[PDB]
């Protein structure tokens, strides 16, 4: 509840400041509106887009590597138990497996970034 009050405030001040920032410029002394805005023709900035697989793949590997990261995240709790052998075995095993994924993708044509 306490931190929820902090979230209620911190969401207010965001909202308030935003509102002030919208009022005052169109609450300003003189607001004048003329110029046309051409959405118009495709080559203004860039043109069109042939969205490329590289960036998307970066999102993907961000997923798989997340999953392995959070699967690894509880370890600081687990580093202390009555089975140490198994602990080391499967923690080194697990993040070693992460590094195996990375090593594979780094061996194939993936990444390499000039294309």
């Amino acid at each position: 509840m306490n931190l929820m009050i902090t979230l209620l405030t911190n969401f207010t001040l965001a909202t308030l400041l935003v509102t002030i920032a919208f009022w005052l410029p169109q609450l300003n002394v003189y607001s004048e509106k003329t110029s046309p805005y051409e959405c118009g023709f495709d080559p203004m900035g860039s043109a069109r887009l042939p969205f490329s697989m590289k960036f998307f793949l970066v999102a993907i590997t961000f997923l798989l590597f997340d999953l392995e990261i959070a699967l690894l995240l509880p370890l600081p709790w687990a580093s202390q138990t009555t089975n140490l052998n198994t602990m080391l075995t499967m923690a080194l095993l697990l993040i070693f497996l992460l590094a195996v994924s990375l090593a594979y993708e780094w061996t194939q044509k993936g990444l390499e970034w000039t294309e």
């Binding site: 003329t34 046309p36 805005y37 051409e38 959405c39 118009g40």
Partner: protein
Amino acid sequence: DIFGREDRFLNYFANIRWFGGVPLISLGKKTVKQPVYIVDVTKGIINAIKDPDARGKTFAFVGPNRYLLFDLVQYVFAVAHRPPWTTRDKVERIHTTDRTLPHLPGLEDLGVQATPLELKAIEVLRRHRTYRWLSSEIEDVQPAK
């Protein structure tokens, strides 16, 4: 009613569409109006100023063809699609209805061409999503004209 880029009339109708949807047409109809585009007016003034026999002669300007009913509102609202003031001073102002008296030198008596509403209306309106020219289906009220 003078019509143009930054003007206070048709732009106002474009901006009155907001909440409550009650600009006018309370009783409906009853409003005949003929907006005139601005450059025709100002050319009227400049010919009036540099042409003799424009002195001591009072006269008026006329929207050449349109002479629209309130169908204007839904037209200018139709084309350009869809995104401190005053009281019945203002809404009765815009609700004032007449073309008044025929005999007064209209336009050509001052020797200048007249502009129908359409094209210039597109120009000033702009807005919408801009990506399709389409048609826009001109109102063509011309009631009883």
